[PDB]
Scaffold this active site. Structure first.
Site, PDB file in Angstrom:
ATOM      1  N   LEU A  26      -2.663  -0.693  -1.366  1.00 10.60           N
ATOM      2  CA  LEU A  26      -2.180  -1.887  -2.395  1.00 10.60           C
ATOM      3  C   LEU A  26      -2.640  -2.999  -1.807  1.00 10.60           C
ATOM      4  O   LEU A  26      -2.613  -3.373  -0.760  1.00 10.60           O
ATOM      5  CB  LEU A  26      -0.695  -1.926  -2.751  1.00 10.60           C
ATOM      6  CG  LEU A  26      -0.178  -0.585  -3.414  1.00 10.60           C
ATOM      7  CD1 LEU A  26       1.405  -0.640  -3.465  1.00 10.60           C
ATOM      8  CD2 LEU A  26      -0.621  -0.499  -4.833  1.00 10.60           C
ATOM      9  N   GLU A  40       9.796  -1.952  -6.489  1.00  9.88           N
ATOM     10  CA  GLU A  40       8.599  -1.810  -7.423  1.00  9.88           C
ATOM     11  C   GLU A  40       8.230  -0.185  -7.547  1.00  9.88           C
ATOM     12  O   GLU A  40       7.969   0.392  -8.445  1.00  9.88           O
ATOM     13  CB  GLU A  40       7.301  -2.760  -7.172  1.00  9.88           C
ATOM     14  CG  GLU A  40       6.355  -2.968  -8.302  1.00  9.88           C
ATOM     15  CD  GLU A  40       5.740  -1.902  -8.803  1.00  9.88           C
ATOM     16  OE1 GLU A  40       5.208  -1.049  -8.335  1.00  9.88           O
ATOM     17  OE2 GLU A  40       5.721  -1.464 -10.315  1.00  9.88           O
TER      18      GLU A  40
HETATM   19  N1  NDP Z   1      -1.687  -0.868  -8.350  1.00 10.21           N
HETATM   20  C1  NDP Z   1      -1.457   0.266  -8.570  1.00 10.21           C
HETATM   21  O1  NDP Z   1      -0.781   0.613  -9.496  1.00 10.21           O
HETATM   22  C2  NDP Z   1      -2.359   1.404  -8.327  1.00 10.21           C
HETATM   23  C3  NDP Z   1      -3.274   1.224  -7.481  1.00 10.21           C
HETATM   24  N2  NDP Z   1      -4.359   2.260  -6.767  1.00 10.21           N
HETATM   25  C4  NDP Z   1      -5.269   1.822  -5.753  1.00 10.21           C
HETATM   26  O2  NDP Z   1      -6.524   2.036  -6.797  1.00 10.21           O
HETATM   27  C5  NDP Z   1      -7.491   2.810  -5.663  1.00 10.21           C
HETATM   28  C6  NDP Z   1      -7.783   4.038  -6.165  1.00 10.21           C
HETATM   29  O3  NDP Z   1      -8.404   4.131  -7.300  1.00 10.21           O
HETATM   30  P1  NDP Z   1     -10.150   4.189  -7.752  1.00 10.21           P
HETATM   31  O4  NDP Z   1     -10.701   3.608  -6.764  1.00 10.21           O
HETATM   32  O5  NDP Z   1     -10.425   3.703  -9.223  1.00 10.21           O
HETATM   33  O6  NDP Z   1     -10.155   5.913  -7.983  1.00 10.21           O
HETATM   34  P2  NDP Z   1      -9.584   7.007  -8.834  1.00 10.21           P
HETATM   35  O7  NDP Z   1      -8.061   7.398  -8.430  1.00 10.21           O
HETATM   36  O8  NDP Z   1      -9.634   6.733 -10.272  1.00 10.21           O
HETATM   37  O9  NDP Z   1     -10.494   8.304  -8.391  1.00 10.21           O
HETATM   38  C7  NDP Z   1     -11.748   8.165  -8.594  1.00 10.21           C
HETATM   39  C8  NDP Z   1     -12.166   9.602  -8.550  1.00 10.21           C
HETATM   40  O10 NDP Z   1     -11.691  10.490  -9.400  1.00 10.21           O
HETATM   41  C9  NDP Z   1     -12.258  11.395 -10.012  1.00 10.21           C
HETATM   42  N3  NDP Z   1     -12.138  11.147 -11.544  1.00 10.21           N
HETATM   43  C10 NDP Z   1     -11.716   9.980 -12.202  1.00 10.21           C
HETATM   44  N4  NDP Z   1     -12.144   9.916 -13.498  1.00 10.21           N
HETATM   45  C11 NDP Z   1     -12.382  11.063 -14.012  1.00 10.21           C
HETATM   46  C12 NDP Z   1     -12.461  11.842 -14.826  1.00 10.21           C
HETATM   47  N5  NDP Z   1     -12.337  11.291 -16.124  1.00 10.21           N
HETATM   48  N6  NDP Z   1     -12.828  13.356 -14.930  1.00 10.21           N
HETATM   49  C13 NDP Z   1     -12.999  13.698 -13.596  1.00 10.21           C
HETATM   50  N7  NDP Z   1     -12.865  13.215 -12.273  1.00 10.21           N
HETATM   51  C14 NDP Z   1     -12.521  11.861 -12.437  1.00 10.21           C
HETATM   52  C15 NDP Z   1     -14.028  11.211  -9.374  1.00 10.21           C
HETATM   53  O11 NDP Z   1     -13.644  12.278  -8.152  1.00 10.21           O
HETATM   54  P3  NDP Z   1     -15.191  12.893  -8.071  1.00 10.21           P
HETATM   55  O12 NDP Z   1     -16.031  11.932  -7.658  1.00 10.21           O
HETATM   56  O13 NDP Z   1     -14.615  13.949  -7.178  1.00 10.21           O
HETATM   57  O14 NDP Z   1     -15.418  13.498  -9.300  1.00 10.21           O
HETATM   58  C16 NDP Z   1     -13.663   9.639  -9.003  1.00 10.21           C
HETATM   59  O15 NDP Z   1     -14.575   9.664  -8.063  1.00 10.21           O
HETATM   60  C17 NDP Z   1      -6.817   2.697  -4.338  1.00 10.21           C
HETATM   61  O16 NDP Z   1      -7.089   1.321  -3.894  1.00 10.21           O
HETATM   62  C18 NDP Z   1      -5.403   2.836  -4.883  1.00 10.21           C
HETATM   63  O17 NDP Z   1      -4.313   2.365  -3.527  1.00 10.21           O
HETATM   64  C19 NDP Z   1      -4.308   3.474  -7.615  1.00 10.21           C
HETATM   65  C20 NDP Z   1      -3.404   3.704  -8.535  1.00 10.21           C
HETATM   66  C21 NDP Z   1      -2.401   2.550  -8.858  1.00 10.21           C
HETATM   67  C1  9QO Z   2       2.819   4.510  -4.288  1.00  5.94           C
HETATM   68  C2  9QO Z   2       2.588   5.634  -3.128  1.00  5.94           C
HETATM   69  C3  9QO Z   2       3.043   5.102  -2.106  1.00  5.94           C
HETATM   70  N1  9QO Z   2       4.112   4.963  -1.375  1.00  5.94           N
HETATM   71  C4  9QO Z   2       4.464   4.489  -0.042  1.00  5.94           C
HETATM   72  N2  9QO Z   2       5.591   4.627   0.407  1.00  5.94           N
HETATM   73  N3  9QO Z   2       3.551   3.641   0.547  1.00  5.94           N
HETATM   74  C5  9QO Z   2       2.110   3.983   0.222  1.00  5.94           C
HETATM   75  N4  9QO Z   2       1.287   3.192   0.908  1.00  5.94           N
HETATM   76  C6  9QO Z   2       1.800   4.394  -1.144  1.00  5.94           C
HETATM   77  O1  9QO Z   2       0.606   4.197  -1.411  1.00  5.94           O
HETATM   78  C7  9QO Z   2      -0.023   3.025  -1.866  1.00  5.94           C
HETATM   79  C8  9QO Z   2      -1.454   3.182  -2.535  1.00  5.94           C
HETATM   80  C9  9QO Z   2      -1.477   4.229  -3.639  1.00  5.94           C
HETATM   81  O2  9QO Z   2      -1.062   3.073  -4.722  1.00  5.94           O
HETATM   82  C10 9QO Z   2      -0.346   3.910  -5.838  1.00  5.94           C
HETATM   83  C11 9QO Z   2      -0.437   5.212  -6.156  1.00  5.94           C
HETATM   84  C12 9QO Z   2       0.448   5.780  -7.215  1.00  5.94           C
HETATM   85  C13 9QO Z   2       1.221   4.685  -8.028  1.00  5.94           C
HETATM   86  C14 9QO Z   2       1.199   3.302  -8.009  1.00  5.94           C
HETATM   87  C15 9QO Z   2       1.841   2.458  -8.720  1.00  5.94           C
HETATM   88  C16 9QO Z   2       1.595   2.685 -10.099  1.00  5.94           C
HETATM   89  N5  9QO Z   2       0.702   3.419 -10.634  1.00  5.94           N
HETATM   90  N6  9QO Z   2       2.085   1.711 -10.786  1.00  5.94           N
HETATM   91  C17 9QO Z   2       3.096   0.949 -10.501  1.00  5.94           C
HETATM   92  N7  9QO Z   2       3.984   0.143 -11.294  1.00  5.94           N
HETATM   93  N8  9QO Z   2       3.425   0.863  -8.997  1.00  5.94           N
HETATM   94  C18 9QO Z   2       2.609   1.796  -8.249  1.00  5.94           C
HETATM   95  C19 9QO Z   2       3.142   1.569  -6.586  1.00  5.94           C
HETATM   96  C20 9QO Z   2       4.422   2.076  -6.543  1.00  5.94           C
HETATM   97  C21 9QO Z   2       0.198   2.856  -6.832  1.00  5.94           C
END
Ligand code: NDP
Ligand code: 9QO
EC number: 1.5.1.3
Length: 186
Positions: free
Chosen positions: A22, A30
């Site tokens: 994050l 959160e």
């Molecule tokens: N703030 C938040 O709420 C969230 C933050 N994060 C952060 O975002 C980052 C991770 O996200 P991001 O980098 O976008 O990567 P993704 O989690 O979207 O992973 C990308 C991989 O997933 C596969 N993929 C994605 N879409 C498809 C599809 N439609 N069909 C088949 N495979 C698919 C591919 O794998 P392959 O190459 O093997 O095909 C691709 O390389 C991290 O930094 C994480 O911490 C993640 C979630 C939530």
């Molecule tokens: C969150 C998993 C996690 N948990 C602990 N305790 N430590 C970490 N470093 C950690 O991974 C941080 C990087 C991975 O980011 C994600 C992964 C899946 C979901 C979300 C996510 C989301 N999709 N929507 C909202 N609203 N909020 C969040 C964060 C709670 C973020």
């Protein structure tokens, strides 16, 4: 199978990630919100299902992985089987949704929650159908390398409130944030 939803926490500059983590320090409440919303099923005897990209799966530390009380489905075209701790593997979003509509799963799964990352969000967001986005607005800029896609407000309506979602400003670790829900149907 029930509603399809995205959920994300995003900074002012639209950042969601930085090097598999994050962009901001851990915000515990959160995390609790995320967990509560994705795990709570409105139907007795059903679970929600979480869909995430491969990199999102692996950005969850082993300690928090699989997301408990939910079915965990990972998207990848490189992987030949679900990662250790995950339940299902699909090669596309459509495939993942089809899988939920199978006789096996259609009776088990209530809500489907896309929990990341960018390309998964973009795909779901730009795909015709009923969809809600649960968006936490982190009200500061944080250096990021992964961003949330644009929300088209011509089709996504910001809802005036929503049950189980606090409407006022939250603050943790000196960082203010608020919860939003958007809904389209096209
Ligand atoms: N703030 C938040 O709420 C969230 C933050 N994060 C952060 O975002 C980052 C991770 O996200 P991001 O980098 O976008 O990567 P993704 O989690 O979207 O992973 C990308 C991989 O997933 C596969 N993929 C994605 N879409 C498809 C599809 N439609 N069909 C088949 N495979 C698919 C591919 O794998 P392959 O190459 O093997 O095909 C691709 O390389 C991290 O930094 C994480 O911490 C993640 C979630 C939530
Ligand atoms: C969150 C998993 C996690 N948990 C602990 N305790 N430590 C970490 N470093 C950690 O991974 C941080 C990087 C991975 O980011 C994600 C992964 C899946 C979901 C979300 C996510 C989301 N999709 N929507 C909202 N609203 N909020 C969040 C964060 C709670 C973020």
């Amino acid at each position: 199978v029930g509603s399809l939803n995205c959920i994300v926490a995003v900074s002012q500059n639209m950042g969601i990630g930085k090097n598999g983590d994050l962009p901001w320090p851990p915000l515990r409440n959160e995390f609790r919100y995320f967990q509560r919303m994705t795990t709570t099923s409105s139907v007795e005897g059903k679970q929600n299902l979480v869909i995430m990209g491969k990199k999102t799966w692996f950005s969850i530390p082993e300690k928090n992985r699989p997301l408990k009380g939910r079915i965990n489905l990972v998207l990848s075209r490189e992987l030949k089987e679900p990662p250790q701790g995950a339940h299902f593997l699909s090669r596309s979003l459509d495939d993942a949704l089809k899988l939920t509509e199978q006789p096996e799963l259609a009776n088990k799964v209530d809500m489907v929650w896309i929990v990341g990352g960018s390309s998964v969000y973009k795909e779901a967001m730009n795909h015709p159908g009923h969809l809600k986005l649960f968006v936490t607005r982190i009200m500061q800029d944080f250096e990021s390398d992964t961003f949330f896609p644009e929300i088209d407000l011509e089709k996504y309506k910001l809802l005036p409130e929503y049950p189980g979602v606090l409407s006022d400003v939250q603050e943790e670790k000196g960082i203010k944030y608020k919860f939003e829900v958007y809904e389209k149907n096209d």
